[PDB]
Amino acid sequence: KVFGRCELAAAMKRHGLDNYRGYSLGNWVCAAKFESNFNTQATNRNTDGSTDYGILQINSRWWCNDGRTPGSRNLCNIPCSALLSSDITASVNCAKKIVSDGNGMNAWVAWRNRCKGTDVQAWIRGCRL
Ligand SMILES: O=S(=O)(O)c1cc2c(O)c(c1)Cc1cc(S(=O)(=O)O)cc(c1O)Cc1cc(S(=O)(=O)O)cc(c1O)Cc1cc(S(=O)(=O)O)cc(c1O)C2
Ligand SMILES: O=S(=O)(O)c1cc2c(O)c(c1)Cc1cc(S(=O)(=O)O)cc(c1O)Cc1cc(S(=O)(=O)O)cc(c1O)Cc1cc(S(=O)(=O)O)cc(c1O)C2
Numbered sequence: 001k002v003f004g005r006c007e008l009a010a011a012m013k014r015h016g017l018d019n020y021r022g023y024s025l026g027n028w029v030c031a032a033k034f035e036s037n038f039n040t041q042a043t044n045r046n047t048d049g050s051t052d053y054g055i056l057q058i059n060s061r062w063w064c065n066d067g068r069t070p071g072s073r074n075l076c077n078i079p080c081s082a083l084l085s086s087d088i089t090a091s092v093n094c095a096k097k098i099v100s101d102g103n104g105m106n107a108w109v110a111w112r113n114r115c116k117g118t119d120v121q122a123w124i125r126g127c128r129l
Contacts, residue, residue, distance in 0.1 A: 058098070
């Protein structure tokens with residue numbers, strides 16, 4: 001499913017992401033915009049042979065199993081394909097583990113490149129939350 005911006009903002013708020021590990025909701029929405037374009041089925045291959053999966057582009061080296069990635073640790077204990085459903089729950093639950101691990105949101109490249117340090121509240125303005 002491709003979420004609308006405000007639709008995803010409400011869904012992320014419903015999943016308790018607002019200020020999760022201190023990251024305001026706008027951070028999460030901005031991350032999803034530039035990671036997946038709000039598309040729950042997005043997949044993108046990386047240089048190290050890993051692939052990023054779903055709405056938050058969770059990586060197959062450390063977080064989920066896709067059977068083709070070197071150095072696989074599968075820390076969310078899930079097939080990567082399970083992070084591609086229309087509901088954001090599995091992605092959120094894995095993201096909560098990732099963002100708690102010590103590096104915060106710096107795990108997400110598109111978030112670092114496009115969202116970090118910016119006025120991320122722009123991403124939730126005008127949304128019914
Ligand atoms: O209409 S939507 O495009 O928003 C939609 C999104 C999702 C969907 O799975 C469905 C529709 C199909 C669907 C329809 C219905 S219906 O009302 O009978 O037509 C019911 C369900 C369903 O999956 C079952 C369902 C209901 C609810 S609740 O009504 O809000 O309690 C939640 C879910 C359900 O599967 C989980 C869910 C959450 C989310 S979230 O936006 O990430 O929270 C997205 C989708 C989900 O299926 C993903
Ligand atoms: O987030 S959405 O993109 O889905 C959206 C839906 C609707 C919208 O009207 C708006 C956005 C714009 C909007 C945003 C805000 S904000 O909270 O400041 O971001 C406020 C309004 C508004 O129209 C004005 C408004 C206020 C209230 S209040 O709770 O009584 O203060 C209710 C409404 C408002 O329009 C009615 C309303 C509720 C809803 S809701 O999703 O059921 O809450 C959606 C839409 C509505 O027009 C229909």
